[PDB]
Amino acid sequence: PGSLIVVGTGIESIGQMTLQALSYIEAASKVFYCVIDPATEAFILTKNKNCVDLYQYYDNGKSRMDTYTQMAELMLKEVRNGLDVVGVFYGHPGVFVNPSHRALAIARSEGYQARMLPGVSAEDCLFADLCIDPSNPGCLTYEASDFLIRERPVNVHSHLILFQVGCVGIADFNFSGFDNSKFTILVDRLEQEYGPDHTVVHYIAAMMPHQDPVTDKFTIGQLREPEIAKRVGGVSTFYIPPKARKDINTDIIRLLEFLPAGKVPDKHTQIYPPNQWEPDVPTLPPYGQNEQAAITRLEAHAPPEEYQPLATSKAMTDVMTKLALDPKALAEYKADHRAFAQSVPDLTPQERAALELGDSWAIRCAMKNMP
Amino acid sequence: GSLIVVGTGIESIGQMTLQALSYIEAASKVFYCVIDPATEAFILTKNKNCVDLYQYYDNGKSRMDTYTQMAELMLKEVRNGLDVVGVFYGHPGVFVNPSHRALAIARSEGYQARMLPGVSAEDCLFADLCIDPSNPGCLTYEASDFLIRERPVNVHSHLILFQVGCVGIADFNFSGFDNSKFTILVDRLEQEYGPDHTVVHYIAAMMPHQDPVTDKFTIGQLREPEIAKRVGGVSTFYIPPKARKDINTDIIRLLEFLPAGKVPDKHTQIYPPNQWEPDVPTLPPYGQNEQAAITRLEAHAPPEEYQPLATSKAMTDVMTKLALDPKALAEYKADHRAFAQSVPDLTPQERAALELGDSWAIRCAMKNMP
Ligand SMILES: Nc1ncnc2c1ncn2[C@@H]1O[C@H](CSCC[C@H](N)C(=O)O)[C@@H](O)[C@H]1O
Ligand SMILES: Nc1ncnc2c1ncn2[C@@H]1O[C@H](CSCC[C@H](N)C(=O)O)[C@@H](O)[C@H]1O
């Protein structure tokens, strides 16, 4: 009896909140939120009548871990009283967020329903604004101070993302912001691992819908310029592109049959597109001889035989939207599949049967058939 | 012409962001690639002009040709002056080839190009497994690329592998992938981690009533034919740290982290522990430092420097519209004053902040009036 759901709000105000985060806000018994955008906070207050701002539990000179302990306990206290508590943290609520993990784990240890819903993180915004794929060529993400304290290894051939570069070695809080006086220690490490000429991108996603992202391209040595290091604050994130590209192992690529068997891959060339923040890698052009061949093959393209297009009804689309947008209806459906199933209007006989089964394959067959 | 690329999250409908939906509705043309029928059934009700990109896959047809065709279908509409919005499930730029190719070409030729972030499978992995990438760092690889280019592991940090069910397959089949080189991946993981180390097979729920797959195996167990069978196209591996890295005490004092009279714990991590990691010396939840912080809550008042929100409903609604209505945002960015002077019931300070547009002015207008 009593539960704790933790949701996120994304980074950019309001717009980056997920539909299910909003739905679990409204259905909550009490809301504890920690956001750093005024419109987002106002947006949370109009969707639930019982909200407490967790930001007030920071204080000047007060340890952040002590604030995190208090933030977790304020939620767990309402949980142990049998309330349905929803915790709110901007971005992804479990990405570089201490009190959410502490509160959910303690509630689990005491036998309560606990669950975190994912959200859009600052790393997600970084991928989008910088148009980089973590797949190419791998992504490593560190907390900036932990990266120094435990001397975590770099991967100069993959992406590097550093959070909290604006509070290096700071366990305190100050409403005015951080005095990043240990920033030079981080610069010393980045220079030692990458050299002073390598690129570092100072990233700050736009928090308001009309603002532009900060995507400023520096070298690591330029971070020692006073006017540069003052620009990084509490919502600053560093992206360091790969310094070089690792070679393909032709022996392993023949074992995996990535390329056609008989050919030797290109040793100094990546496939299009290039990373615009990366030192120049020889990259193939967008429209080679293999590319236009597939583009001109579009002239003779027909829907494949095994391609099965969507073929559902208005009633089936509405009931699955409801299961995704209505936590009240979802809780009833999981409690009794058939009693919920025969209650939905206008469902075709197979649609009622598929929804009563609930299996992924039955629901997909019901939405791909239709007489 | 322009190209806006958005995502839908992993779990159907519910994990779409509010701004992804608004750019769907306001779009002239929509090209989508989702793998959930209800989500696809959610999209076509929001825009009358959609094309399913999934049809450009084919049996025996190279994925790279499809990605070239997927990007070209959007690009040739962009060169014709329409406002195109491409849709890919999850985060549209996380392990997605055609989205980046189309945006790069669109940029190179001078068109407006923007990607909106979405909720990825890695985001869902963080939530369902309830782990934090900060503790102790997170390394993400494409499974085959991790093998082909012999990428280094980091046994002290998180490891996440995408596409473990498609090891080395460049082709497509509607029946899915024949993960016949999966044993090459298992060989590498055992060499780096040992056969007894944990690997979590993760499949986020795609439907609202499903529960996630969070199966705890050992790397050696992956060789069991009935284990290798259950990893497919939407499978992701999580590998917890094999050990924790030591704190460098010299670096600790360079940073002046703790009081220069107190010495921190050298071989104990903070609560909570990673429930998927081999047992690490972990602090209890309610130590005396925590209990001291609990009892100090009784004497809590809002600090003097704390500035609570103090706004109006007219101001709340205009910023909601700017975030939820892309056409009003385009108007406002084109002329702040014309937009600011046109919104009704705005306090004169509120219109002045809106006309400025600066973050400092908007935040002052929303926290100031007593
Ligand atoms: N608007 C923004 N742009 C870039 N990074 C940001 C950001 N807001 C917060 N961050 C990063 O996140 C750190 C705070 S911890 C909070 C992170 C949040 N839970 C998330 O999902 O990202 C900051 O030190 C900064 O590195
Ligand atoms: N439901 C799911 N659960 C776990 N991993 C998933 C998943 N769906 C997709 N993936 C991962 O994503 C890969 C496809 S590439 C598509 C990724 C998507 N853009 C995203 O944001 O995550 C798969 O190989 C799998 O590793």
PDB file of C-alpha atoms in Angstrom, chain A residues 13-104:
ATOM      1  CA  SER A  13      10.646  23.607 -21.130  1.00  0.00           C
ATOM      2  CA  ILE A  14       7.405  21.609 -21.255  1.00  0.00           C
ATOM      3  CA  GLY A  15       7.847  20.394 -24.825  1.00  0.00           C
ATOM      4  CA  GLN A  16      10.285  17.590 -23.996  1.00  0.00           C
ATOM      5  CA  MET A  17       8.032  15.992 -21.364  1.00  0.00           C
ATOM      6  CA  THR A  18       6.667  12.574 -22.273  1.00  0.00           C
ATOM      7  CA  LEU A  19       2.928  11.939 -22.441  1.00  0.00           C
ATOM      8  CA  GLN A  20       3.144   9.244 -19.766  1.00  0.00           C
ATOM      9  CA  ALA A  21       5.136  11.500 -17.434  1.00  0.00           C
ATOM     10  CA  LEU A  22       2.315  14.044 -17.692  1.00  0.00           C
ATOM     11  CA  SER A  23      -0.332  11.370 -17.086  1.00  0.00           C
ATOM     12  CA  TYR A  24       1.398  10.070 -13.952  1.00  0.00           C
ATOM     13  CA  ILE A  25       1.732  13.658 -12.703  1.00  0.00           C
ATOM     14  CA  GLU A  26      -2.033  14.183 -12.819  1.00  0.00           C
ATOM     15  CA  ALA A  27      -2.935  10.856 -11.184  1.00  0.00           C
ATOM     16  CA  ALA A  28      -0.457  11.307  -8.318  1.00  0.00           C
ATOM     17  CA  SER A  29      -1.501  11.711  -4.703  1.00  0.00           C
ATOM     18  CA  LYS A  30       1.394  14.111  -4.059  1.00  0.00           C
ATOM     19  CA  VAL A  31       4.069  15.559  -6.351  1.00  0.00           C
ATOM     20  CA  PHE A  32       7.652  16.350  -5.341  1.00  0.00           C
ATOM     21  CA  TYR A  33       9.438  18.121  -8.193  1.00  0.00           C
ATOM     22  CA  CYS A  34      12.967  19.428  -8.798  1.00  0.00           C
ATOM     23  CA  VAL A  35      13.084  21.404 -12.052  1.00  0.00           C
ATOM     24  CA  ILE A  36      15.177  24.446 -12.924  1.00  0.00           C
ATOM     25  CA  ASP A  37      12.859  26.101 -15.456  1.00  0.00           C
ATOM     26  CA  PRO A  38      10.096  28.484 -14.293  1.00  0.00           C
ATOM     27  CA  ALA A  39       7.548  27.626 -16.994  1.00  0.00           C
ATOM     28  CA  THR A  40       8.100  23.897 -16.421  1.00  0.00           C
ATOM     29  CA  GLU A  41       7.445  24.356 -12.696  1.00  0.00           C
ATOM     30  CA  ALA A  42       4.312  26.384 -13.444  1.00  0.00           C
ATOM     31  CA  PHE A  43       3.294  23.683 -15.917  1.00  0.00           C
ATOM     32  CA  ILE A  44       3.577  21.072 -13.122  1.00  0.00           C
ATOM     33  CA  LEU A  45       1.457  23.088 -10.688  1.00  0.00           C
ATOM     34  CA  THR A  46      -1.566  23.248 -13.021  1.00  0.00           C
ATOM     35  CA  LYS A  47      -1.669  19.434 -13.502  1.00  0.00           C
ATOM     36  CA  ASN A  48      -1.754  18.379  -9.834  1.00  0.00           C
ATOM     37  CA  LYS A  49      -3.188  20.234  -6.847  1.00  0.00           C
ATOM     38  CA  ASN A  50      -0.694  18.752  -4.329  1.00  0.00           C
ATOM     39  CA  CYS A  51       2.882  19.722  -5.241  1.00  0.00           C
ATOM     40  CA  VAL A  52       5.960  20.463  -3.124  1.00  0.00           C
ATOM     41  CA  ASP A  53       9.058  22.110  -4.589  1.00  0.00           C
ATOM     42  CA  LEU A  54      12.150  20.115  -3.624  1.00  0.00           C
ATOM     43  CA  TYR A  55      14.508  22.934  -4.662  1.00  0.00           C
ATOM     44  CA  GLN A  56      13.909  24.722  -1.341  1.00  0.00           C
ATOM     45  CA  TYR A  57      15.905  21.991   0.440  1.00  0.00           C
ATOM     46  CA  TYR A  58      19.162  23.170  -1.052  1.00  0.00           C
ATOM     47  CA  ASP A  59      20.921  25.843   0.992  1.00  0.00           C
ATOM     48  CA  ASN A  60      24.089  27.920   0.940  1.00  0.00           C
ATOM     49  CA  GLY A  61      27.042  25.945   2.271  1.00  0.00           C
ATOM     50  CA  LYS A  62      24.748  22.937   2.786  1.00  0.00           C
ATOM     51  CA  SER A  63      26.064  19.610   1.514  1.00  0.00           C
ATOM     52  CA  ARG A  64      24.276  18.357  -1.590  1.00  0.00           C
ATOM     53  CA  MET A  65      24.245  14.794  -0.241  1.00  0.00           C
ATOM     54  CA  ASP A  66      22.402  16.023   2.854  1.00  0.00           C
ATOM     55  CA  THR A  67      19.865  17.679   0.549  1.00  0.00           C
ATOM     56  CA  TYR A  68      19.601  14.430  -1.427  1.00  0.00           C
ATOM     57  CA  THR A  69      18.940  12.473   1.773  1.00  0.00           C
ATOM     58  CA  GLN A  70      16.198  14.926   2.759  1.00  0.00           C
ATOM     59  CA  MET A  71      14.640  14.888  -0.716  1.00  0.00           C
ATOM     60  CA  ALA A  72      14.414  11.090  -0.676  1.00  0.00           C
ATOM     61  CA  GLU A  73      12.947  11.066   2.836  1.00  0.00           C
ATOM     62  CA  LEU A  74      10.258  13.650   2.048  1.00  0.00           C
ATOM     63  CA  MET A  75       8.949  11.274  -0.618  1.00  0.00           C
ATOM     64  CA  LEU A  76       9.407   8.047   1.355  1.00  0.00           C
ATOM     65  CA  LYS A  77       7.475   9.542   4.292  1.00  0.00           C
ATOM     66  CA  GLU A  78       4.381   9.975   2.120  1.00  0.00           C
ATOM     67  CA  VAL A  79       4.989   6.483   0.719  1.00  0.00           C
ATOM     68  CA  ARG A  80       5.033   4.822   4.146  1.00  0.00           C
ATOM     69  CA  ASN A  81       1.777   6.649   4.948  1.00  0.00           C
ATOM     70  CA  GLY A  82       0.204   4.731   2.044  1.00  0.00           C
ATOM     71  CA  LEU A  83       0.194   7.558  -0.507  1.00  0.00           C
ATOM     72  CA  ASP A  84       0.792   7.281  -4.255  1.00  0.00           C
ATOM     73  CA  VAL A  85       3.852   9.527  -4.572  1.00  0.00           C
ATOM     74  CA  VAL A  86       5.316  10.816  -7.841  1.00  0.00           C
ATOM     75  CA  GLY A  87       8.829  12.250  -7.872  1.00  0.00           C
ATOM     76  CA  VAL A  88       9.801  14.695 -10.642  1.00  0.00           C
ATOM     77  CA  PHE A  89      13.316  15.588 -11.787  1.00  0.00           C
ATOM     78  CA  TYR A  90      14.082  17.518 -14.953  1.00  0.00           C
ATOM     79  CA  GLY A  91      15.573  15.691 -17.900  1.00  0.00           C
ATOM     80  CA  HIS A  92      15.882  11.959 -17.347  1.00  0.00           C
ATOM     81  CA  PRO A  93      15.092  11.422 -13.640  1.00  0.00           C
ATOM     82  CA  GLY A  94      17.754   8.733 -13.177  1.00  0.00           C
ATOM     83  CA  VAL A  95      20.576  10.335 -15.162  1.00  0.00           C
ATOM     84  CA  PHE A  96      22.981  12.130 -12.794  1.00  0.00           C
ATOM     85  CA  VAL A  97      20.263  12.273 -10.121  1.00  0.00           C
ATOM     86  CA  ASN A  98      21.052  10.947  -6.633  1.00  0.00           C
ATOM     87  CA  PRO A  99      17.792  11.279  -4.635  1.00  0.00           C
ATOM     88  CA  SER A 100      15.639   9.414  -7.175  1.00  0.00           C
ATOM     89  CA  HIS A 101      17.750   6.247  -7.005  1.00  0.00           C
ATOM     90  CA  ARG A 102      18.001   6.445  -3.207  1.00  0.00           C
ATOM     91  CA  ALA A 103      14.251   6.881  -2.731  1.00  0.00           C
ATOM     92  CA  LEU A 104      13.277   4.089  -5.135  1.00  0.00           C
TER      93      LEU A 104
END
